[PDB]
Design a protein around this nucleic acid. Structure first.
Lengths: 82, 70, 97
DNA sequence: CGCGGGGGACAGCGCGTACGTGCGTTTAAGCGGTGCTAGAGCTGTCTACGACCAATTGAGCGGCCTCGGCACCGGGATTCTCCAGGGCGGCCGCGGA
DNA sequence: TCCGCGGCCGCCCTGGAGAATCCCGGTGCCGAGGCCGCTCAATTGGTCGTAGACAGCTCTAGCACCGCTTAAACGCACGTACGCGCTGTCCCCCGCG
């Protein structure tokens, strides 16, 4: 729950995700590098989310909070709380 | 009552039901009513009218005097 | 002899299935463990509701699927079909990330 | 997590030609000038043209509950593909006169 | 030198086979949208203002050309060397338990 859960996105999970990109073979070192990329993106989103949460005088983080966090990325298409 | 199979097996396209158990509990009329609904669903959920309000010998005699046909 | 399909044979009907079906493909509880373990560092003992978790996984899944499609395009551009580290880094760099 | 293996990633070397670099000689722009006139622009103006709350108002919603649709196998040749014999691309070699 | 023939025999085509197809129904289930309350700001009216183009001077530089002076382009001829073709190698993750 709070210790070494980065393996939640597992190697078979990464292989299945790469199946959706249209690839036949996934190399061994692909899994951990895409894990690091996902970690970086998730950290970048959640930093903005938690900073907004602190600004809003709120203790809980809502879905619309991360919606605004991703809003300044610059696309903002459909989704919950759009 | 809150069990998943309570609602899973109560709506089968079957014309006859059979239930086997070792021994039903003497007290806690909740599961007795649950089994009564299991055999076929007609009995009202209000099991407190027959008993459970008001003595132990009379209560168990009335309990045995209402489940005799089945 | 066993009906051993050649590599790349089942993939046809498999992509026929999962292109139409639209369910999830990642274990939920490990993912919520991950989002917790990354949240406590930013803010401990967060009282997570039932929401604000599926949106994150859906967003990251869409982003990584787009990245994987771009990586496959780069691999085909590289006169090959398989994925590799260089394909991923080139796709990420050309995406502005 | 484990193994067979086979299509696919990755490299070595010849082709040769496809740009690349060094010869002359241009076609059209940069600069000096110009004489104008043609578009860009704020000032008296004054008016029309937008905003907001009284009497009404309608209109879409707040909440439930029926029911014609969701989910997918009994039910299944064909599609999708994979793998073993047959005639063959013939290929080819070798030897009497 | 003919060519009879025999062998390496192994490969696309054909027949057999493995799993799925996406509807016909069964059974079970599933929350949209109209309907008793409602409400509430919208819609005209009157007042307030105000500023923003209609003229009108204005002003200022665009521009098309007249007339010199080069600047990289362009073709060609040879260099060469590296993508590509062709081929060989190995490899390690896909399919399956």
């Amino acid at each position: 729950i709070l210790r070494d859960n980065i393996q939640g996105i597992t190697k078979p999970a990464i292989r299945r995700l790469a199946r959706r990109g249209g690839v036949k073979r996934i190399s061994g070192l692909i899994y951990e590098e895409v894990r690091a990329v996902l970690k970086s993106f998730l950290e970048s989103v959640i930093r903005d989310s938690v900073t907004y949460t602190e600004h809003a005088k709120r203790k809980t983080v809502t879905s619309l909070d991360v919606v605004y966090a991703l809003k300044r990325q610059g696309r903002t298409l459909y989704g919950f709380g759009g | 009552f809150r069990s998943t199979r309570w609602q899973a097996l109560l709506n089968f396209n079957t014309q006859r039901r059979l239930l086997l158990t070792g021994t039903p509990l003497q007290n806690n009329l909740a599961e007795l009513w649950s089994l009564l609904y299991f055999l076929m669903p007609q009995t009202v959920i209000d099991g407190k009218k027959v008993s459970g309000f008001a003595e132990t010998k009379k209560t168990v005699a009335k309990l045995h005097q209402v489940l005799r046909p089945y | 002899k066993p009906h051993r399909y050649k590599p790349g044979t089942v993939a046809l009907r498999e992509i026929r299935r999962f292109q139409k079906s639209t369910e999830l493909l990642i274990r939920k509880l490990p993912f919520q463990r991950l989002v917790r373990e990354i949240a406590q560092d930013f803010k401990t003992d967060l009282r997570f509701q039932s929401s604000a978790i599926g949106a994150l996984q859906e967003s990251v899944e869409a982003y990584l699927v787009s990245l994987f499609e771009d990586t496959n395009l780069a691999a085909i551009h590289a006169k090959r079909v398989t994925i590799q580290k260089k394909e991923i880094k080139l796709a990420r760099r050309l995406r502005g990330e």
